[PDB]
Symmetry: C3
Subunit: 307 residues, 3 copies
């Protein structure tokens, strides 16, 4: 059976642990695994460009021995003059895996329903599961065992990072709190899936508007930009609601004394996170960015071996 | 002494047979030929984007051991900052071959007359000769011998696939029929070149507006996108009714993308006669064979 | 060890430049014999403004060192700080190659990156092209020390500045022939004058193109106008016509003189067909040598850093 990775809970707790261990092994020995030797191809397709996502995948695929064929948004968007199913059938003849950045989850589902190679969600509207693998690798590096840790996410609680932190976090046994204003709460289906997965791992899900309560006793504090490019014209003031949730020094001081801070780059210094927090000793954002390379390579190695 | 591939008949019948044999060998052993090991470079230049063309060449060059340097939209189209002759001299210092998607054929001929490395027409307004190499590879693996098969192309008979199926088909000994409406017939000079080449191979060239007669007894049925501004092409749709008139075990080809419901139906596209998925994959193998062959003689 | 950068031509001492140029000759002869980036290791190649010629040379050169070039096109400083970019890239790649505009941006990146930073091309310098030029001159003429080189045209552009600095580092007597108002930046000119003291070279700036051509071993020109200057308000044709590198000018130089021009050339403006395509032209070898000289520079910086 062909395995895909479209959202964080596509891996069981045991499987996620396997991928995270592989990510640590690959960080130590980055060119020791060559499942794409040849080179074999991997398609890396962007319905909307993401330079950082392309950078890490392109280099990582090369270090697995392969050749990434990158298709940027300058090409005709998939689905516009050929069905996704037809594209999947041809790609399955050319490459050993399909890495895709797209929008709605239904598009990823349609591709994965037909492709005979693994399909990976590089980044989408609803989830960012590869970044959360990198996040979990980073937390393990700086904290040790993930089970039982307390992680709080602040800001827009319905964006892709909030959803993947919920799903990926509870899969790892982490107690996850989303601190967000009313009207910006996690998708109910994602929250229910996280609550169910949490029953298997001893984790828990909390959603609150009380940012100070969310930070108290936290081991990991996370935030992300308050607005995606697609949201700039949605009509909302996307600054005023989030100001109480800014990851600043006062908020960090409420957390456990050994707490660390994560943020997917790019960051907007002075909005969701302050310079003092970005550049202080609690910040893990630089290691986090680097671990995108290793965690994505580990995911590819794992999916290719299982598929 | 430096060989180019700008149109289908740039290869003789014997040379075409060599390239198709190489494509079959490379399909079976895709990293066994490493003429570009190093890596040595190959330029892949697009005056107009073609993602599918870029995709197959880029991966194929890598599997020959090389590094494709791709110049597409956003990067500099050739001849805007310097003469094409100046570009050809510098490229000949950097890469071992030049793969170019451009429009008019006078631009390809100009490059090829100056460059001292092989120039390949990746796709042009007048010819699509790499796709036809992939088509011939697909027909051979489904049918065996190409000589004496009947191939019919339906739809726009003035586009690059019609021209290349004429030239490449008769070069392989295939009897080629183009079924097209009156405003969309092959370029007369291309048709004449195909009729001449067919004399050497025992093939033939037929142009007709009668889609039923073109489908009757055909072994290979081919179509392509038509672009109601498509009224004249509707009688030429590859549907189940047309396919039912062909020889037993006939196959259907279509350079992708396909507009399902226009030039070809779901039933034909997804049925047992369709070979469009193997055909798409064989662009990789046939283009690698072409490059290996041109590099060995250049 | 100190991380070494190459942002302008005099970032290499005379002895260091000689080492890089010797390595360029070795790599031209044996282009896959140095594999410091085997793995592959990454090299970031970043363009604030796209340059297809720069991309081709670096992309292929990095690959021939065993590495993988990760190209980032103009389609830095906007989404995140240059310091933030340097921190993260220093974790991904073994070197940063950057085409940008003002020199202060290169300086800032190099001040904080923990891997070598290379100026691929900037508004003020083009030091990789001048390494390729020096490699070409050495192939055609042998020892560089004591040669006389004259550059004609816009005397304040990146090629004029780098021919001054890189030329006098190699011991070449450099003349810049340019009209009033188009003269080398004073700081660059003073730096070249000081460096020329160390090598026995010299710096000459003149408006007399005929005097600059007489006795020259190497004649160089470049486009009169960069893309960012097309809207600067000046007539950028009339001042430069007396400085065209044509057959009459070349005839004034030494009988064995060679001609250089960083491509692309606008035939009929700064250079003529007869010169460009005649036996004195070295422009094609010069373009090829971008590949070899940049590979040599990368090998050298990586080993020193
Ligand atoms: O995932 N990457 O490749 C990547 C690259 C660069 C950055 B950075 O400059 O912000 C971040 C991430
Ligand atoms: O030649 N290729 O690489 C290629 C790639 C993709 C397609 B397709 O999705 O239709 C077709 C051809």
């Amino acid at each position: 059976v062909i395995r895909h990775f479209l959202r964080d809970d596509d891996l069981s707790p045991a499987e996620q642990a396997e991928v995270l261990e592989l990510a640590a092994e690959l960080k130590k020995d980055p060119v020791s695994r060559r499942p794409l030797q040849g080179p074999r191809g991997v398609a890396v397709i962007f319905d909307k460009n993401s330079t950082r996502t392309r950078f890490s995948f392109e280099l990582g695929i090369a270090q697995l021995g392969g050749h990434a064929v990158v298709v940027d948004s300058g090409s005709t968007q998939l689905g516009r003059d050929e069905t996704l199913q037809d594209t999947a059938k041809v790609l399955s003849r050319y490459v050993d895996a399909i890495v895709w950045r797209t929008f709605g989850q239904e598009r990823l589902d349609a591709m994965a329903s037909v492709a005979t190679v693994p399909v990976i969600n590089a980044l989408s509207d609803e989830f960012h599961p590869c970044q959360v693998l990198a996040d979990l690798q980073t937390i393990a590096e700086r904290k040790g065992a993930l089970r039982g840790l307390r992680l709080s996410y602040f800001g827009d609680g319905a964006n892709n990072m909030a959803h993947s932190l919920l799903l990926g976090g509870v899969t790892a046994g982490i107690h996850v709190t989303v601190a967000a204003p009313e009207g910006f709460l996690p998708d109910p289906s994602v929250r229910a899936a996280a609550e169910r997965r949490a029953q298997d791992t001893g984790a828990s899900v909390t959603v609150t508007a009380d940012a100070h309560a969310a930070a108290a006793g936290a081991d990991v504090l996370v935030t992300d930009t308050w607005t995606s490019m697609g949201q700039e014209n949605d009509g909302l003031d996307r600054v005023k609601p989030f100001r109480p949730f800014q990851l600043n020094s006062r908020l960090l001081a409420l957390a456990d004394s050994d707490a660390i801070v994560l943020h997917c780059l790019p960051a907007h210094r002075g909005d969701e996170i302050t310079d003092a927090v970005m550049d202080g000793p609690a910040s893990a954002v630089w290691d986090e960015a680097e671990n995108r390379l290793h965690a994505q390579k580990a995911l590819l190695v794992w999916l290719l071996e299982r598929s």
